[PDB]
Design a protein around this nucleic acid. Sequence first.
RNA 1: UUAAUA
RNA 2: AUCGAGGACUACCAAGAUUAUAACGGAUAACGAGGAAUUGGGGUUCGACAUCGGAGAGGGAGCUUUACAGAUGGCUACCACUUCUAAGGAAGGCAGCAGGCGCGUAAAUUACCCACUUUCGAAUUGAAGAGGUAGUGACGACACAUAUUGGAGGGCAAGUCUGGUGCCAGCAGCCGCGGUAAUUCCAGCUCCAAUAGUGUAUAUUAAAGUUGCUGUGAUUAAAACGCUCGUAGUUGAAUUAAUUACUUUGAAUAAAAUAAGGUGUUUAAAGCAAAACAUUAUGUUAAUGAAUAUUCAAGCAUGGGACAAUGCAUUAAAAGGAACAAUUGGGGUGAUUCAGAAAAUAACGGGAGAGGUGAAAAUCCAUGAUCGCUAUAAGAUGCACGAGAGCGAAAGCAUUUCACUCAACUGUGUCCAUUAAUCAAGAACGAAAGUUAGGGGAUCGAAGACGAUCAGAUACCGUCGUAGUCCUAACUAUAAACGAUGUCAACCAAGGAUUGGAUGAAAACCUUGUUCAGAACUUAAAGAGAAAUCUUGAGUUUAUGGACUUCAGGGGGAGUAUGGUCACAAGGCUGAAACUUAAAGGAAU
RNA 3: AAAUGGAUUUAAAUCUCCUUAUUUAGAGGAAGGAGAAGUCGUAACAAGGUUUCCGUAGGUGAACCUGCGGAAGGAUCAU
Lengths: 130, 129, 95, 150
Amino acid sequence: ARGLHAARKMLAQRRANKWADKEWKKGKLVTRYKCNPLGTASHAKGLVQEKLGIETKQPNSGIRKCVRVRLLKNGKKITAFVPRDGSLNYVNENDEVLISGFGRRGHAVGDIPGVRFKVVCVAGVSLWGL
Amino acid sequence: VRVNVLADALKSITNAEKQGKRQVMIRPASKVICEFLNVMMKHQYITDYTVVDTHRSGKIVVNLNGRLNKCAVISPRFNVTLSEFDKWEANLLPSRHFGALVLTTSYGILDNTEARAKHTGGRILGFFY
Amino acid sequence: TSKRRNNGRSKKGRGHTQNVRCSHCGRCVPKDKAIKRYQIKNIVEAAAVRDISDNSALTKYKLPKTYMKLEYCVSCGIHGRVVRVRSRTDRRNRL
Amino acid sequence: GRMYNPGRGISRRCIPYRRSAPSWLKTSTLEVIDEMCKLAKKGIAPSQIGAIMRDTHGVGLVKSVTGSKVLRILKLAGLAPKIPEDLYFLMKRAVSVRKHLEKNKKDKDAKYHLILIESKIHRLTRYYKSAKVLEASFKYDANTASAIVS
RNA sequence: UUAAUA
RNA sequence: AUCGAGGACUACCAAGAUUAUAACGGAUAACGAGGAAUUGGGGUUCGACAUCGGAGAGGGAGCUUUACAGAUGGCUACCACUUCUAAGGAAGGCAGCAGGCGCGUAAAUUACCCACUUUCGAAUUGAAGAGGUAGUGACGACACAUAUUGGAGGGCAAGUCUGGUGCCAGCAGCCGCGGUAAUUCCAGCUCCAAUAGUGUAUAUUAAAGUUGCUGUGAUUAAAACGCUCGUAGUUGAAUUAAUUACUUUGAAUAAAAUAAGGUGUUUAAAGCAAAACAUUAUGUUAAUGAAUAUUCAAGCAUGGGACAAUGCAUUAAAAGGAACAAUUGGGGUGAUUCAGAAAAUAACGGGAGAGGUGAAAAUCCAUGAUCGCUAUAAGAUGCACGAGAGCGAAAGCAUUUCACUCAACUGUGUCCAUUAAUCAAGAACGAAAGUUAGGGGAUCGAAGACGAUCAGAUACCGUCGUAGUCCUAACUAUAAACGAUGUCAACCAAGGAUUGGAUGAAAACCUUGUUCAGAACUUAAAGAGAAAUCUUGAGUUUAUGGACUUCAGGGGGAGUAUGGUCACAAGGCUGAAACUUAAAGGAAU
RNA sequence: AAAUGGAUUUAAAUCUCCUUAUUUAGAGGAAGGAGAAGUCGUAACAAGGUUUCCGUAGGUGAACCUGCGGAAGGAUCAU
């Protein structure tokens, strides 16, 4: 339909064909409010309950230290990295932490086995300056 | 079926010049086809043409002289406002000195240069470099 | 992709052809795709033709021949050395 | 190409570049009209009427002699059939195929071609109604066409 | 005739 | 009844109103607009919040006063709360300005004054948490001193410097570096970028020609419905010396904002004021207000009528349809009819094997098998002719005769006069397998049973064998239903041959010239493509637009779950998400 | 003209059914994905050792095997 009066089908075709966009459909359908532990929020707060260590993928070797967090807004249970060197010793238990994303990689990112969230505060200032 | 006779004619002319042919033949003749050729003659892109009468919307034979790079028709003839001229030329023409559009207006079928001079817009027909 | 322009068949202006049976495998192959060879041989081998002609009860009886058309599937045509695998540029030769 | 199958033939007629009657033709319109008039009374299609004049009377084009087409001549005399000739012949074929189909129920190619023929009828009937040739009350029906076509 | 795996 | 039209309400009367051009529903983390962010053009996303319009005061509901309220810094009742109490009783509604609790990643003083703008009032005077001033304020923007933030393998500017660490700790957005000589870890020195800023995380925009109107792809990478008919929709041959659409000018239209005119806020972001000089009260001066232009979709007026739609008489399209003449057709349906292979039976001869395999075995045979001749009656099949040949929309179609049909090509000074092309919804046909009920049941044979082989063999090999294979009626509606290539139309390099016609020559058949239609083939230094390859297109495409429909958006999950619908059933049509992953894939060396 | 009685109008509030939507528990069952260099086989890529694949039907520990009909994306563009 390349005609001069064929604007109904041209407009209607883009409506249907736009739903095949994986990156665009995901941001429109109702899943960011139900299937996202973080939600729309950039950062979230939760309580540390368990200190975990996840083995890396096959071409790597070592244990990725991380923590298990119970968020306040929802109540879900997640896993959060502990950035740079020796920062797990700074993290106590049953305390509030600020959890904030990662890049997004191929979804998962840098503690390898399915972790997608990194602890940026320990109540304190920073699991940087600390 | 033949929807646009002008599209058939301009494709015949462009094909003939890519092969270096001297003259080409167009089976269905129209007023619009004749006007498009007249515009192309005024810019000396075709030497001349003759129209044979077959009592059946007769044929046109066009003489070409190594100058018509490409003449093409434009599908549905958009209503070109006078302010939309340079938007069309920037898209369809190679530069600001070489080619020329073709528009059908109430004052006849004219290229973009003299339609701008006559201060009138209309539907766009085609172009030629 | 397409190793052959004609897809290895001889069917151009139709959609279906009947089947034939491989003379060695018994496989079902379409009539056009089958490798058809013709054979015309005498009923007496070259060694025994002299022996039969010596002691015969007929004046000048001419030995008859046998005629039969053999059709092979692709697998049993290649394996039986009826046809060989050819070069990429020599596949096109049809003579 | 043809409407319903991929066949593509260009078997046409070629009208000469002479809209007037040829010099050797001498019969006036009076003989042409009455000769055509008598043929119409005999129950002959307008397409066949012109052919008979061309083959026998040498009047190959009637518009070149009388200045008006065969159908226009027949309408003026009132001898034009109520059902247009091209539509009438199409309903004659649909009836004939249907009659054969009553006894041969298993013929699946005749059912297909009957469907194509009836689709043509609904295309022509729609056009002639927009051209006011057929009154809007006209409608093609299998149970009825057998009688009017007959 | 039979001939599995790293 | 109301200020008033009006089913706004009542009585009687009639059966109407909307819908594929998406009604009625559902969602919104939806108040609308001026506008904002980013943009080569086109666009995409945002707009609670300056200003305009709407609605609300914890939730509904009902009212009073009055010119204006269904008012809540007014009242009444119910629900949920809060406070005082002398225990009898009572008021109150911060989505007003400060402030407090909670919530969250996320957001400031329980300040002073009516002096600016303006509103109300009995009025030059009184009020105003409107408004102004002050305090906090790395949200942002501008000018400007002399120091921090991140990094140093690549993308990406910067160290093959030295100490520790030894596939650990770790770094790492991606590829990856680390197993003791780390350019990537932890440090020291050095320099790389930006700089009063600089990193991180989430989201918008560009990149993305990875959402396509400009502008994509569909043979093989993902993707042309199995095929045809068909309504809405879209697109429609040439042709002529009242509206609409199109186009040119305007009218009218809130500012702020955008663009843009002037102006030395010391420049600048700003402001719309200040002065340039008159040394200025005087005078420019009755000084500037950018013409400030926009601006899309509608509406109004005006000049033009080429290209178009609805209007209400041209020709005869290498558009289409119809007719006729001669044909072509393994096109379809019905009846008729021929053939002998295999197997079964009958009779006769013969007398010890036969099958089958790589070798065997299971099995058949003295009740005479295999083998040989002669006779029969059903089932099925249709060799050789048989082809890169023909017909058909596709699936598909092969013994010869007769009917009934159908389609196409060619021939035509025959007819109509646009009747056309493609087509959501819808409808016919749709291999094989499978289902239902009859008939038939020869051969082969999913299942099954034996015997071999093997480590095992539920398989390949051999023997037997049920459903099935065949016909009739009715379902089913799927295939690598393939040319993996939608339908229609135009242009288009050299050939040789073939099928069916027409037309000359050469005496149905055959050899040649021309031309129409069909299935194909060969060559190309040319066109295209990632290449293989395509050339009766997969060419005429960044020099991008002939018409229409369908489909695709990294790989999986998955054509799965659920919902709907069709079927007797198997199943078919429509058809996700969670989660997971840096590749999967195509052509070629 | 105040208490008060009655009949309409507008009707909050509450209760009982019924529907829709969202979230969430469940013995057991059938799936998918990831990890661990776990048992059992050799299915596919070479003619992959029975050419591979598609539709359908049946069977089987498992890839899969077999029957019917297709395709070459074949290992044949060829008598």
